[PDB]
Design a protein around this ligand. Structure first.
Ligand code: CA
Ligand code: CA
Ligand code: MG
Ligand code: MG
Ligand code: NA
Ligand code: NA
Length: 342
DNA sequence: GAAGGATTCT
DNA sequence: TCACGGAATCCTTC
């Protein structure tokens, strides 16, 4: 099984430069201005010239400006980014129909039967990679390996505009030598718990019992890491189609008055439905980020589909459900739909 | 199960 | 109105 992974290089930034090639070379920064007071919001992701100064996705726009106040700060244009993404997603589809679209800027392709013997695989990387460059003016990094996990580590290790392979050999090394926080799925929270147990590399898992790890990371990740470590990991390229569609939005002020919150919640609902299209959800969920951030949520699953009209109402019920259990004020508000009808 | 929370990642 | 956006998914609840 050979797994070829394409992550696009700082995507939303790149697209903005492709649409405006005068930016290229400067440091472009793509953000989500919340109009909550002129520079309220967060970065979204950022050109390499910009990244290298510590301006990364997720930091506050005003934090970023203490760093690069002369860099180009553009507002996140999601649809533009999506139509440029599908063009690319389609291009790769032709290469190995057995693909799995990870995110807006990620795709796994299974090239097991399309090619055998990595030498071949690498060359395809160049083709795939070169073709997107050709068609979309978008540079991408390519990671190859026996499975999704390692294929992606390769891409991680080689970005931007990169192309790394990862033969078993190296793979067997990484099991032993690669730092555990760099294993995909593993973030700081779980990394810190792993250091505490003593585990720093994948191989270490086979030194600890397993029921313990379940204690601290839960069987789920507990099986996962042991699986990779074992070299016995294999998850074929599913093509998971979205299992959840939502929206959250940032109010221009914290609230506990509905009429105040209400116009946002619908603004969210209307979008969420456009995002849904021909899909009909059996479940709704109203999510609220508090003046604190305790990210509270009340929901409901109906035994039938939810019509837009029913999505309004219930939500207002669910917003009220929140408005009086906790007692804190609301920062962001939104809705999330699930449990679709096949 | 269904429900609500926590975690990971751009 | 005075730093923390948006989107999923998992992974663990009662
Ligand atoms: Ca990591
Ligand atoms: Ca299998
Ligand atoms: Mg990426
Ligand atoms: Mg990226
Ligand atoms: Na049960
Ligand atoms: Na019960």
């Amino acid at each position: 099984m050979i797994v070829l992974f394409v992550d696009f290089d700082y995507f939303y930034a790149q697209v903005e430069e492709v649409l405006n090639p005068s930016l290229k070379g400067k440091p472009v920064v793509v953000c989500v201005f919340s109009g909550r007071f002129e520079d309220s919001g967060a970065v979204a992701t950022a050109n390499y010239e910009a990244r290298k100064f510590g301006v990364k996705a997720g930091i506050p726009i005003v934090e970023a400006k203490k760093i690069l106040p002369n860099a180009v700060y553009l507002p996140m244009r999601k649809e533009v980014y999506q139509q440029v993404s599908s063009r690319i997603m389609n291009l790769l589809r032709e290469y190995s129909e057995k693909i799995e679209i990870a995110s807006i800027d990620e795709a796994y392709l299974d090239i097991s039967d399309k090619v055998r013997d990595y030498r071949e695989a690498y060359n395809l990387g160049l083709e795939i990679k070169n073709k997107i460059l050709e068609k979309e003016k978008i540079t991408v990094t390519v990671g190859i390996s026996k499975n999704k996990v390692f294929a992606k580590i390769a891409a991680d290790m080689a970005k931007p505009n990169g192309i790394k392979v990862i033969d078993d050999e190296e793979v067997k090394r990484l099991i032993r030598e690669l730092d555990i926080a760099d294993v995909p799925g593993i973030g700081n929270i779980t990394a810190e718990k792993l250091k505490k147990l003593g585990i720093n590399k994948l191989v270490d898992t086979l030194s600890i019992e397993f029921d313990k790890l379940k204690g601290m990371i839960g069987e789920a990740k507990a099986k996962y890491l042991i699986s990779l470590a074992r070299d016995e990991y294999n998850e074929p390229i599913r093509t998971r189609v979205r299992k959840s569609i939502g929206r959250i939005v940032t109010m221009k002020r914290n609230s506990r008055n509905l009429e105040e919150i209400k116009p946002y919640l619908f603004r969210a609902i209307e979008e969420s439905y456009y995002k849904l299209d021909k899909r009909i959800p059996k479940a709704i969920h109203v999510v609220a980020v508090t003046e604190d951030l305790d990210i509270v949520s009340r929901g409901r699953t109906f035994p039938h589909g939810i019509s837009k009209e029913t999505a309004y109402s219930e939500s207002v019920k669910l917003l009220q459900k929140i408005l009086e259990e906790d007692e804190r004020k609301i920062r962001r508000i939104g809705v999330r739909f699930s449990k679709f009808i096949e």
